[PDB]
Design an enzyme around this catalytic site. Sequence first.
Site, short mmCIF file in Angstrom:
data_model
loop_
_atom_site.label_atom_id
_atom_site.label_comp_id
_atom_site.label_asym_id
_atom_site.label_seq_id
_atom_site.Cartn_x
_atom_site.Cartn_y
_atom_site.Cartn_z
N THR A 267 0.85 -1.22 0.00
CA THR A 267 0.00 0.00 0.00
C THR A 267 0.88 1.25 0.00
O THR A 267 0.49 2.23 -0.63
CB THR A 267 -0.96 -0.05 1.18
N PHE A 392 -7.37 4.54 5.98
CA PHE A 392 -6.75 3.60 6.95
C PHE A 392 -7.82 2.79 7.67
O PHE A 392 -7.53 2.19 8.72
CB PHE A 392 -5.86 4.36 7.93
N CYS A 399 -5.77 0.86 10.48
CA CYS A 399 -4.38 0.52 10.14
C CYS A 399 -3.45 0.78 11.33
O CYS A 399 -3.36 1.93 11.78
CB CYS A 399 -3.94 1.33 8.94
C1 LIG Z 1 -2.81 -9.14 4.80
C2 LIG Z 1 -2.85 -8.92 3.52
C3 LIG Z 1 -2.71 -7.63 2.82
C4 LIG Z 1 -2.60 -7.57 1.43
C5 LIG Z 1 -2.45 -6.36 0.78
C6 LIG Z 1 -2.42 -5.19 1.50
C7 LIG Z 1 -2.52 -5.22 2.87
C8 LIG Z 1 -2.66 -6.43 3.53
#
Ligand SMILES: C=Cc1ccccc1
EC number: 1.14.14.1
Length: 454
Positions: A267, A392, A399
């Site tokens: 991300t 988030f 997050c």
């Molecule tokens: C836990 C898997 C995950 C996959 C892509 C973005 C953030 C978390």
Amino acid sequence: IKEMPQPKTFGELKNLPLLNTDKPVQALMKIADELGEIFKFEAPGRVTRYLSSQRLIKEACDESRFDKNLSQALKFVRDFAGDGLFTSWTHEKNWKKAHNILLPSFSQQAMKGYHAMMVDIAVQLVQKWERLNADEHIEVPEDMTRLTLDTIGLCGFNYRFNSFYRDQPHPFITSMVRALDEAMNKLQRANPDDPAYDENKRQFQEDIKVMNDLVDKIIADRKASGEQSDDLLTHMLNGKDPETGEPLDDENIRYQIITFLIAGHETTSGLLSFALYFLVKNPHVLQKAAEEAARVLVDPVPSYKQVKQLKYVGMVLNEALRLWPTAPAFSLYAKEDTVLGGEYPLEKGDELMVLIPQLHRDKTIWGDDVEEFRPERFENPSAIPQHAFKPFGNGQRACIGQQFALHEATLVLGMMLKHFDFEDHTNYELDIKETLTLKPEGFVVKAKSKKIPL
Ligand SMILES: C=Cc1ccccc1
Ligand SMILES: CCCCCCCN1CCC[C@H]1C(=O)N[C@@H](Cc1ccccc1)C(=O)O
């Protein structure tokens, strides 16, 4: 009490074939454009409701009424991320236990401790671009992935992926990308156990073993290190839940490492890629961010204190997360029977999807200029309505990595703007690749050095 609209159906497959596209989030945004703030979406034996308005999402964010749900995408990712923080239910013992144990790894004191290792990787990025020849270009998402993977590896685990020593993706990345593409592709499959997908399942298990082999090595590298790290892996191996008094077990630790390696970079690489995209498409904004970088970053090595003073760079990153939030949806379920927006009755267990990019385009919140890149929208958090801006996620399931990601991205974009002038030499047409997460594809620029020493 209103009946909600629903997009076109395909007999017994209901809406499932609408996900038969390489760009399903963008497809769902186009459906939201047509149908409005709420629509029903059905697959065989399943139902969800896509929310796009701040009016309904502010209610969905009430933790007394709605808890985090595992979307089908997260149930598929759970095949390798298990009951790690991202793919655990709130009510699983290992969610609150791991939350309590790992939250201190994101304290202000912890962030000050990570800063020097973030600088190590940022300097490798700047040196790579300083060393390109005349009219060589940068592969932006490729280099942002090298940086963010290396940063979570070094800060989190004292492990060097050495991504800037590789012209091809690290094998971890090749496997992780193919796992995520498989999870996304599997969303559209009515009959997932059809032997036609036997090869997909073999490849998936192979990609999982590649990711577990790397986790093995990180755990081995730490076991035998005989050195004092106080990082994320230290807390996983040694930290105790103040509540239960217990540490995480080995199975849950393996899931947390996989989770933080994937979530801790995929991300952030998208965010940096979209941020640079918006900056080269908005030269006035780039000039303002570059002036801040020049005024604040007065030392060859940026300090923690200096990154905290890159306030405008912080607003640039929030505005990039407004237009293209790189984890573009989260899912909720009703804890009890309730009514959404005084119009939409829900029963206990009913599911919702929050379509974040569409929330962030709500004209009732942002005004008619919603497609414009204007970081100044974020000057005053008190002037933004509650739950208008959700890149988030929400509440206790928000997050855990938010301040880590933003410190890293602020540091890196600050150094980029201090050290180089950028040119959109191809007049790049934005092409958003979907792997559950969102990232520009084929985004390239030229970076002309300002010749400022490191
Ligand atoms: C836990 C898997 C995950 C996959 C892509 C973005 C953030 C978390
Ligand atoms: C890894 C971090 C990002 C996760 C984002 C997940 C968000 N999906 C990424 C691709 C599309 C989007 C989504 O709307 N998915 C739904 C699809 C679905 C709905 C109803 C029935 C069957 C399947 C889901 O997975 O349930």
